[PDB]
Amino acid sequence: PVMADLNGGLQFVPELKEFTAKLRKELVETSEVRKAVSIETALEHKVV
Amino acid sequence: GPIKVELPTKETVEIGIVDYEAGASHGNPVVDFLKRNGSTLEQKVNLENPIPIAVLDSYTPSTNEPYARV
């Protein structure tokens, strides 16, 4: 019986769950903060 | 104006200031933002229903000279 490992080295990353959650959280944080700040700036320009 | 933060004793202490200056403008952005994002604190609170006190009758004097002179 043959066992082929096609995991691309992902097994060496420690705490994969936490690492991926951190990556995704940082991405959503960036997106939402940018969107909300742009909306607020647009409203302030339109009112001024 | 001052910005203050509520303390665990429900007391407010100052932690910063608001300041905004502009030339020609069509409105105030600070208050617009605060209205859209904050809540208004009103010191007046209305009773469940008004409580009638009385209906009274009064008369204006025939001459305004005494009040004018006092």
Swiss-Prot record, chain A:
Oligomer status and interactors: [Alpha(6)beta(6)] hexamers of two multifunctional subunits (alpha and beta).
Changes after translation: 4'-phosphopantetheine is transferred from CoA to a specific serine of the Acyl carrier domain by the C-terminal PPT domain. This modification is essential for activity because fatty acids are bound in thioester linkage to the sulfhydryl of the prosthetic group.
Species, as recorded: Saccharomyces cerevisiae (strain ATCC 204508 / S288c) (Baker's yeast)
High-level lineage: Eukaryota, Fungi, Dikarya, Ascomycota, Saccharomycotina
Miscellaneous section: Present with 17000 molecules/cell in log phase SD medium.
PTM-bearing positions, type Phosphoserine: S38
Family named by the database record: Belongs to the thiolase-like superfamily. Fungal fatty acid synthetase subunit alpha family.
Protein name (record): Fatty acid synthase subunit alpha
Record function comment: Fatty acid synthetase catalyzes the formation of long-chain fatty acids from acetyl-CoA, malonyl-CoA and NADPH. The alpha subunit contains domains for: acyl carrier protein, 3-oxoacyl-[acyl-carrier-protein] reductase, and 3-oxoacyl-[acyl-carrier-protein] synthase. This subunit coordinates the binding of the six beta subunits to the enzyme complex.
Chain segments annotated as transmembrane: none
From Swiss-Prot, chain B:
Stretch of the intact protein here: 1487 to 1556 of 2051
Leftover remarks: Present with 91800 molecules/cell in log phase SD medium.
Highest taxon listed in the record's lineage: Eukaryota
Protein name: Fatty acid synthase subunit beta
Entry function: Fatty acid synthetase catalyzes the formation of long-chain fatty acids from acetyl-CoA, malonyl-CoA and NADPH. The beta subunit contains domains for: [acyl-carrier-protein] acetyltransferase and malonyltransferase, S-acyl fatty acid synthase thioesterase, enoyl-[acyl-carrier-protein] reductase, and 3-hydroxypalmitoyl-[acyl-carrier-protein] dehydratase.
Similarity comment text for this entry: Belongs to the fungal fatty acid synthetase subunit beta family.
Gene: FAS1
Self-association and partners: [Alpha(6)beta(6)] hexamers of two multifunctional subunits (alpha and beta).
